[PDB]
C-alpha cells in the first residue's frame, strides 16, 4: 500500500519513470554503484585533512529535527548544506558526541545477540586461565587453519542458501536444501528467529558471521584448534610461548 503509491509517485516524473522503465533488474546493481565519488587512494591524509574542517562528516537529514543546530556553548552541530550527490547533510563531530550524551535512548538488549560471536570471544577471553611463559625457539610452520570459532562447516554459498531460507523465504529461488544438516540448521535457526524485530539484513549478516567457515594460511606452532588460533597473537612469538586455556 505505502510502497505502491511511492512507486506511482516516482513513475509520475519523466526522469525517474525513464530510469525505472529502461533499467533492467540485472543492471539494478550497476546503477546502485553509479557515483561521481572516487574511492580515496590516501584515506589517512584526507581524514587528517578533513577533520580540521567544520562539518567534516555526513548524516541523514533527519538529524535536522533530532539534534539542535547549536549546543549550550553555541557551537554548530550540523549544517543545511547537502552532500555532493546525496540528500544527506554535512554535520560536525559534535553532533555525534552530543547524540552520545543527550540523544534518544533505546534498549540495547538485541546487540549481544547481533554480534554474538564477538561477545563469545569476549567471554572466552574473560574466563581464560594463563600460565608460565616458556622462552624457547618456536618452530612455527605455515599451515592453513580455520579462523572462525563458531564454524558450522558450511561454505560461503552453502551457508548463504540457509541464510536466504531463514531470512528471505520467498526470495530463495529454485534452490532446495539438499542436505539434511542444512535442513536441520534451517529448522533450528528459524525456530529461534520466530519474532525478532531487527531488520532482515542484520539477521543475514548475523548468520553469515555465525555459520560461514573461513580459512587462512598463517604460521602456527602447536594448538591448531579453532579457539586457539583466535589468540595466536597472545600465545606464540619468535622466542616465547604463552600457555593459555581459553574459556
Amino acid at each position: 500500500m505505502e510502497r505502491i503509491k511511492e512507486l506511482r509517485d516516482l513513475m509520475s516524473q519523466s526522469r525517474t519513470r525513464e530510469i525505472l522503465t529502461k533499467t533492467t533488474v540485472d543492471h539494478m546493481a550497476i546503477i546502485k554503484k553509479y557515483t561521481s565519488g572516487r574511492q580515496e587512494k590516501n584515506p589517512a591524509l584526507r581524514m587528517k585533512w578533513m577533520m580540521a574542517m567544520k562539518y567534516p562528516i555526513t548524516a541523514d537529514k533527519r538529524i535536522m529535527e533530532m539534534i539542535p543546530e547549536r549546543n549550550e556553548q553555541g557551537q554548530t552541530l550540523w549544517s543545511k548544506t547537502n552532500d555532493a550527490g546525496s540528500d544527506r547533510v554535512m554535520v560536525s563531530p559534535l553532533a555525534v558526541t552530543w547524540w552520545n550524551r543527550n540523544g534518544p535512548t533505546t534498549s540495547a538488549v538485541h546487540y549481544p545477540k547481533i554480534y554474538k560471536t564477538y561477545f563469545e570471544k569476549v567471554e572466552r577471553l574473560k574466563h581464560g586461565t594463563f600460565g608460565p611463559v616458556h622462552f624457547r625457539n618456536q618452530v612455527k610452520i605455515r599451515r592453513r587453519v580455520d579462523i572462525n570459532p563458531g564454524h558450522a562447516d558450511l561454505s560461503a554459498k552453502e551457508a548463504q542458501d540457509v541464510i536466504m531460507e531463514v531470512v528471505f523465504p520467498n526470495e530463495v529461488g529454485a534452490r532446495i536444501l539438499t542436505s539434511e544438516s542444512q535442513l536441520t540448521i534451517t529448522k533450528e535457526k528459524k525456530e529461534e528467529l520466530q519474532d525478532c524485530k531487527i531488520s532482515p539484513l542484520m539477521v543475514a549478516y548475523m548468520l553469515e558471521r555465525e555459520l560461514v567457515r573461513k580459512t587462512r594460511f598463517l604460521p602456527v606452532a602447536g594448538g591448531t584448534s579453532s579457539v586457539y588460533i583466535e589468540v595466536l597473537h597472545l600465545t606464540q612469538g619468535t622466542c616465547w610461548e604463552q600457555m593459555y586455556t581459553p574459556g
Binding site: 587528517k48 611463559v133 520467498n170 529461488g173 619468535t238
Partner: protein, 716 residues
C-alpha cells in the same frame, strides 16, 4: 518468416517470447522455430487461464469475457512467461502460503481452488510420448500435467482435464488453425523436425567483421589469417626448436658470473660541488628553548599565552640587526617581520583574552616572505603563442652538492642523552598475562633509554609543528597565522616545563593536490653563530636579537642570541607524514626487541634485563680516529632512533633509491662475508644505479659516506 509469427500471434505474446529468448541469449534470427514454439506455448497457457474467473467459493465462472467486477479472482495464476526470478518468487510465495509441494522445475500455471500446479505443453509428435517424457522429467509429481498437440489431440494425468470441454476445444481449434496455416506456407516441415533440437542451446560466440580483421593482424609475421595460425598451433609438435635456435644464437648472449671478492668492491663516488646546506623544517642541534616551568600537559594550554610567558622570562632583547644575510632575498623584510611578530605579541598580551589562533596582518614584508602573487597568471595557449620566453617548465637534474661535515656532527648530537624526558605515551589496559608483564618491562626499559634523547625531542617538535601547520592550513586558507613552536618536557626532578623554539608565520594554504606547497616563515632562537659554518645557512637570514647570561664558572659568559629567519614550504603529504614521526620509535625499538628475542632463543630465558642493566654486549655503532667504537644496547637504540628520525626529517626520492640500490650491494657483501662464493653479472650497473641518486641531499650523502666506511671496515 518472422513476418508470419508477428502477424498471427498477439504483439503481447511475441514480445514475451522475445523477452524469454533474449533472457537466455538466443536470437530469433537464428532460432526461428524456437521463437514460434515459445509464442505458441505462451498463447496456449494464457488462453488456458483467460476468461475463467473463480467465484466466491470453490467453483469457477466461465465468463464471456474479461468483465469489470469486484470478483478479481482467477482460477489460475500464470507462472509461465514472467521471468526466472519473478516466476520462482511467485512459486515460492504461493507454496509457502498454501503449503503445496515445491515443484523442482518451473511449472506453467497454478490452480488455486484445487491448490496444485499445472504444466502445459504443445507437441508436434504424439501426445503420449511427450507426456511420459515430462513424467520422467517431473518426478515427485503432484502437479497436473496436461499435454496438447499441434494436430490437436489431448492428454492429461488420471485422464483428468481441469479445463472445461469448450475452452479446451477452443484451444484445440486455435492450434489446429495455426498448424494448417503455417503448413499452407509449408514451414510445418521444419517445425516437425526442429522440436528435439530446440530444447538444447548452442553458444555462438563468433568473430566477424572488424574484430575479425584485427584478429588477422595480431599473429606472428609469417601468418596470413587466424585460421592458419590456429591450425598451425593445433598441429604443432615439439621438435627441439628451442635447442636449434640456442645453437644459432650468438654466444655473446650470456650471463657470465663475475666473482665477488674482497678487492672487488669499490668505494661509492660522491658528487662534487658546493657543500650541502640545511634543509630541515627547523633547527635541530642549534635550537634554543625559553622555559616557564608550567605544570600543564602536552596540550593543556593556549600556545600564544605560553609563548608570551616564555618570552617574558628572558630579558636582554636588543634592537635586532642583520648578522648573516640571506644572500638571495631581502633581509630588511626578515628583520621587519621579526619586529612585526614582536609588536603583534605585545598587542595580544595587552588585550583581555588571549586568542587561541592569531592572524598576522598581511604587510609587504610577509607578502614577499610568504610568496603571495608569485604564481604566474594562468593563460590559454591561444593567447600566448608568440612570446619569446614561453617554454616548458625547467626540468633538469638537481644541482650537485658536496657532502659537508655539519650533517654528521648533527647526527652525532641527535644520538646523545639529555636531562629531560620527551615522551609520555598513552595508557593501555592493565597487564593480566605474564607475557604482558614481560612486554611492559621491556617497554619501560626502551622508554627509559629513549625518552632522554634529542631524536625524541625532534620527534615531538616535528609532530607538533606539522600538526599545527596542517590544522592552520585547513582552518584558515587565507589568513597569515602566527604559530609558536611549543614543546613540553619532564625535568629529571619531575617538574614540568614548556619550551618555546620560535614562531611560524603560515601564509595562504589553498592546498588542492597533495604536492601543493604552503609557504611559511620560520623564526627560531639560537646561540650558534652563523659565521662559523655559513655554507650550512645558505637559505637563512640570521639576526642578532639578544644576549644570554648562562651559568658558568668563568663569571658569566654573556653570549649573544641570534634569530634564524628563513622561508620554507611544506605539503599536505609532507605535513601528514611529519605528523606521524613517532613511527621512528616503533622502527628502532622493534629492531632492538628483534635482537633481544633472537638472543633469547639461544639462551632459554628473557635477556632484556641483562642487556640493559649488565651492559654486557656491545655493537659497532661508529668509528673514532683510533678505530671502530662499540656501544651498549642503549646507544644502539638511540642510534637507530636517530637514523629513523633523520630518514623522516630528510625524506627524498634520492634516499629511497639509494637505500634500495645499496641494500642490494650490502646483501652481496654480506654473502661474501659468509663464504657463500657470491657472484655478479653487472656490478658497474649496480654502482651507477647507486651513484645516480647521490645528488644534493645531505642525509643521502652522509649515508653514502657511511656505506663507504662500512665497506672499508668490512672485507678484511
Amino acid at each position: 518468416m518472422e513476418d508470419f509469427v508477428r502477424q498471427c500471434f498477439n504483439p503481447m505474446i511475441v514480445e514475451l517470447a522475445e523477452k524469454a529468448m533474449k533472457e537466455y541469449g538466443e536470437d530469433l534470427k537464428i532460432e526461428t522455430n524456437k521463437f514460434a514454439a515459445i509464442c505458441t506455448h505462451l498463447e496456449v497457457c494464457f488462453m488456458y487461464s483467460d476468461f475463467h474467473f473463480i467465484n466466491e467459493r470453490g467453483e469457477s465462472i466461465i465468463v464471456e469475457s474479461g468483465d469489470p467486477n469486484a470478483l478479481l479472482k482467477h482460477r489460475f495464476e500464470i507462472i509461465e512467461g514472467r521471468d526466472r526470478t519473478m516466476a520462482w518468487t511467485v512459486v515460492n510465495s504461493i507454496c509457502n502460503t498454501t503449503g503445496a509441494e515445491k515443484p523442482k522445475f518451473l511449472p506453467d500455471l497454478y490452480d488455486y481452488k484445487e491448490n496444485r500446479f499445472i504444466e502445459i505443453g504443445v507437441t508436434r509428435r504424439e501426445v503420449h510420448i511427450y507426456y511420459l517424457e515430462k513424467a520422467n522429467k517431473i518426478k515427485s509429481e503432484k502437479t497436473h500435467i496436461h499435454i496438447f498437440s499441434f494436430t490437436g489431440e489431448e492428454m492429461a494425468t488420471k485422464a483428468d482435464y481441469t479445463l472445461d470441454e469448450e475452452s479446451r476445444a477452443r484451444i484445440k481449434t486455435r492450434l489446429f488453425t495455426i498448424r494448417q496455416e503455417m503448413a499452407s506456407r509449408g514451414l510445418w516441415d521444419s517445425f516437425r523436425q526442429s522440436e528435439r533440437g530446440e530444447e538444447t542451446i548452442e553458444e555462438r560466440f563468433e568473430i566477424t567483421g572488424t574484430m575479425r580483421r584485427l584478429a588477422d593482424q595480431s599473429l606472428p609475421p609469417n601468418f596470413s589469417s587466424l585460421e592458419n595460425f590456429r591450425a598451425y598451433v593445433d598441429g604443432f609438435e615439439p621438435n627441439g626448436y628451442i635447442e636449434g635456435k640456442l645453437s644459432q644464437m650468438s654466444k655473446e648472449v650470456n650471463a657470465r658470473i663475475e666473482p665477488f671478492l674482497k678487492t672487488t668492491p669499490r668505494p661509492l663516488r660522491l658528487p662534487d660541488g658546493p657543500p650541502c646546506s640545511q634543509r630541515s623544517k627547523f633547527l635541530l642541534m642549534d635550537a634554543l628553548k625559553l622555559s616557564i616551568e608550567d605544570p600543564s600537559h602536552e596540550g593543556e594550554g593556549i600556545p600564544l599565552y605560553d609563548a608570551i610567558k616564555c618570552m617574558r622570562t628572558f630579558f636582554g632583547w636588543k634592537e635586532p640587526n642583520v648578522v648573516k644575510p640571506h644572500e638571495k632575498g631581502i633581509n630588511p623584510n626578515y628583520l621587519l617581520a621579526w619586529k612585526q611578530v614582536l609588536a603583534e605579541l605585545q598587542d595580544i598580551e595587552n588585550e583581555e583574552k588571549i586568542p587561541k589562533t592569531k592572524n598576522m596582518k598581511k604587510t609587504s614584508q610577509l607578502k614577499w616572505a610568504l610568496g603571495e602573487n608569485m604564481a604566474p597568471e594562468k593563460v590559454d595557449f591561444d593567447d600566448c603563442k608568440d612570446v619569446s620566453d614561453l617554454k616548458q617548465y625547467d626540468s633538469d637534474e638537481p644541482e650537485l652538492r658536496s657532502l659537508a661535515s655539519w650533517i654528521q656532527s648533527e647526527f652525532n648530537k641527535a644520538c646523545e642523552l639529555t636531562d629531560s624526558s620527551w615522551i609520555e605515551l598513552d595508557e593501555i589496559g592493565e597487564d593480566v598475562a605474564p607475557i604482558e608483564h614481560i612486554a611492559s618491562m621491556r617497554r619501560n626499559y626502551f622508554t627509559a633509554e629513549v625518552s632522554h634523547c634529542r631524536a625524541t625531542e625532534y620527534i615531538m617538535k616535528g609532530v607538533y609543528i606539522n600538526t599545527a601547520l596542517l590544522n592552520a592550513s585547513c582552518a584558515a586558507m587565507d589568513d597569515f597565522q602566527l604559530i609558536p613552536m611549543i614543546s613540553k618536557c619532564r625535568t629529571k626532578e619531575g617538574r614540568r616545563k614548556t619550551n618555546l623554539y620560535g614562531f611560524i608565520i603560515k601564509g595562504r594554504s589553498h592546498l588542492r593536490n597533495d604536492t601543493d606547497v604552503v609557504n611559511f616563515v620560520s623564526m627560531e632562537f639560537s646561540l650558534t653563530d652563523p659565521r662559523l659554518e655559513p655554507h650550512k645557512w645558505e637559505k637563512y637570514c640570521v639576526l642578532e636579537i639578544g644576549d644570554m647570561l648562562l651559568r658558568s664558572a668563568i663569571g658569566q659568559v654573556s653570549r649573544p642570541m641570534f634569530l634564524y629567519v628563513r622561508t620554507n614550504g611544506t605539503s599536505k603529504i609532507k605535513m601528514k607524514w611529519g605528523m606521524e614521526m613517532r613511527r621512528c620509535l616503533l622502527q628502532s625499538l622493534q629492531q632492538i626487541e628483534s635482537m633481544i628475542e633472537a638472543e633469547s632463543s639461544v639462551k632459554e630465558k628473557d635477556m632484556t634485563k641483562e642487556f640493559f642493566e649488565n651492559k654486557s654486549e656491545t655493537w659497532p655503532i661508529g668509528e673514532s680516529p683510533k678505530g671502530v667504537e662499540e656501544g651498549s644496547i642503549g646507544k644502539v637504540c638511540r642510534t637507530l632512533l636517530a637514523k629513523s628520525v633523520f630518514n623522516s626529517l630528510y625524506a627524498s626520492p634520492q634516499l629511497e633509491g639509494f637505500s634500495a640500490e645499496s641494500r642490494k650491494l650490502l646483501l652481496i657483501v654480506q654473502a661474501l662475508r659468509d663464504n657463500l662464493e657470491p657472484g655478479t653479472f653487472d656490478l658497474g650497473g649496480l654502482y651507477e644505479a647507486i651513484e645516480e641518486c647521490l645528488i644534493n641531499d645531505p642525509w643521502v650523502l652522509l649515508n653514502a659516506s657511511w656505506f663507504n666506511s662500512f665497506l672499508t671496515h668490512a672485507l678484511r
